[PDB]
Symmetry: C3
């Protein structure tokens, strides 16, 4: 089972700029080379080139709707292709709106996939509930079937077909949810482990339950969309929306190690690393490093250590 | 069930000054306005005016006995009043000696109340055990029935009548207890969860047990006296007595979220925030912010999010 | 049961210098004086004087083999002596290679001892598996019986006789293991709780299991070799090999408080504190302080507090 890194240097999903530098920062830290040290075969598709849609007027409150919709349609095609060839796709963010194309493309090949969303946010605001027209906080809204027709068709997203049900997604790390978003997750019966559930159960029981909930009845492909801000700012400070009281570096790697062990990881998103948002240079390094470590963990790197087979190290 | 904020800008309870600025700092951060966004009805009683008792000579080792006793008697009257009207009182500290008047006044209306004391300290030194004559460190001593007559009557506190039994108080976050205090808690059989119990059980099991212990036999009003230094200095640095190895920001909010869910919160104290004790401006902000978050959590704010009822956000 | 502090100002175990200043740094913080405040009788043996072996040519890849082997043989003699007199030995590190002499000397008196190794590393590389000829990372290799004859006899260590079986050692805090080391621990069936086990079980269940594994069948002397880097760099930054995602300050003290309570602590190592490796002065202080706190914890200091017996503090 091969791995294919796909760079999504896109930031139109939010008002700030910088997140598009995420892929470069991750590559600069040797993400690709390090992944090749794992048991997986790695191919680098490179960074996608996003054609900016000229005169991309706001759709009501939604900002850059056509540009975000275009970039995502292109990502969806790329991901769908690698998924078709039977490889595991790894999208390096810019902003989380790219999860639309990533999950959409993944679903075209594995419609029965489930989603594990690690984030401090639900990113489930609809074009009608957002306070900011930022699409970075609306990904899940365009992806959920139960939300189809709950908001006006946004220009640039007509190609999107709701691919996952509220029952196939599980959030982990929630701690900054808007009223409308909270209304949506409760009304839709979405499974989640906000920081309070993590504190109560412990990351161990949490992963145990998310797997039982998403995989108990049937084993299907796992799509992990990891927003770096799901971890506490003390670990991933270089993000647009840091929120205190986050998952620890350890819980982050625990989540990933467990996902690796299921042997069902099919798609991965490493989003929101903004190299321009560090108070100091080492804060960026610290954020980039942990994102890289999380990715490596997803593909086998265990904290207890790793060693190559058929190798009598003695 | 209405909420009434009562400011206790008092710092005579300790040698340092600055804690009296706590209420102003908390209000400055919008604590009142933010509370109004909750499901609770909020009224601001304002800050009490403390008449300094002139020529307040030390009683043996105890410092400013008359001034601390007076300020507390006044606080006890105010709190007793709001409690009588059926509102939940919220005292914003200065120093923890104000817990004497706050808990005393609370007990006049709900004598069967229990106390959950979140602190790095037991604050149970008597006028005979204290190394420093600081009344900040002696609150529980004046409040416990089992300690009545165990120390000479201190000028200014004759109005105080021990209102809670050793069996009705539970400590959480202990990690800096004097020999005499340790002797007192063990000899009195006081229930506590020091940092070592928290590490062992997890904050989840801890709240589970404190409620079983204090509420298992009978459901009664809960008085939460929260010393900000109960959380690690990395979260609430702006306090007079920081102690490493404290509760985390998350465990702090977990405690509060759980207390809210009992529906029994009757009295609250947010003490020890000293705006003048930050090594930098943002350490004060960090301390004030978390104190405000803890207060909001006590009244409904959940990390998983909140939404208003009878509101089809969609 | 008396305590005897033995300084091991040695750093030849690694390429960098500075760790030999560890003992001085710990003493400078009043470690000795503080220990005397505990219920234990304390004697300071002082710092050993290590005769540098001139012309200490590398043995294949292994650096300073004769000097490290010599220092350890001397330490082994000293520790064996204090152990014989029925005192608990406490070795203040330089580097962890000194665990060879420390554990070897300890074993001469208590051959049935078990080892609890708190470290981010297994330090079990053999002179054949090390990428660096650093003996700081090969301690356990020279100590394990199952590894006897698995590598060429290194000059300076002929005096060493494998004293512990793979079944008598338990690692805690692992998160940076070489492939060969990982191969060795898995092949040898060594018991360990890497950071992932800690995350899964909680430090409480972990100590519970390490004691059940090492003490369930028979109660025997406990030798605690504590590498300061076992705790996260945020707590012990002043070390040669910091690794993110470490044990917290609290889990560190939990481990020690539990070890104390077994009443079986026989030998202690406080290693890797390098005063010259702090990015700032307070990072050293922070590292030194925590090493000192851990040591005091091993000998009785409880976070819930301590008080002297036959002393009516009231
Ligand atoms: Mn987010
Ligand atoms: Mn997100
Ligand atoms: Mn306190
Ligand atoms: Mn207090
Ligand atoms: Mn180490
Ligand atoms: Mn070591």
């Amino acid at each position: 089972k091969p791995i294919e890194i796909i760079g999504a240097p896109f930031s139109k999903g939010q008002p700030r700029g910088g997140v598009e530098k995420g892929p470069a920062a991750l590559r600069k830290a040797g993400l690709v080379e390090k992944l090749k040290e794992t048991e997986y075969n790695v191919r680098d598709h490179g960074d996608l080139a996003f054609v900016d849609v000229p005169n991309d007027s706001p759709f009501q409150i939604v900002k850059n709707p056509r540009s975000v919709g275009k970039a995502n349609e292109q990502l969806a095609a790329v991901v769908a292709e690698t998924q078709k060839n039977g490889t595991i796709s790894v999208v390096l963010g810019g902003d989380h709106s790219m999860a639309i194309g990533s999950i959409s493309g993944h679903a075209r090949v594995h419609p029965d996939l489930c989603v594990i969303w690690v984030d401090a946010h639900t990113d489930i605001n609809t074009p009608l509930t957002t306070s900011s027209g930022n699409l970075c906080g609306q990904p899940v809204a365009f992806l959920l079937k139960e939300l189809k027709g709950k908001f006006p068709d946004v220009p640039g997203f007509s190609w999107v077909t709701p691919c996952i049900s509220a029952k196939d997604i599980v959030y982990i790390g929630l701690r900054d949810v808007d009223p409308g978003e909270h209304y949506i997750i409760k009304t839709l019966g979405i499974k989640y482990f906000s920081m309070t559930e993590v504190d109560k159960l412990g990351i161990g029981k949490v992963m145990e339950e998310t797997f039982s909930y998403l995989l108990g009845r049937k084993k299907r492909p796992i799509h992990l969309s990891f927003d770096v801000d799901g971890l506490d700012p003390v670990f991933t400070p270089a993000t647009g929306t840091p929120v205190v009281g986050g998952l620890s570096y350890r819980e982050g790697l625990y989540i990933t190690e467990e996902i690796y062990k299921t042997g069902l990881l099919s798609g991965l998103d490493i989003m929101e690393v903004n190299p321009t948002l560090g108070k100091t240079p080492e804060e960026v390094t610290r954020t980039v490093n942990t994102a890289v470590a999380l990715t490596l963990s997803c593909f086998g790197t265990k904290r207890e250590g790793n060693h190559k087979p058929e190798t009598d190290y003695l």
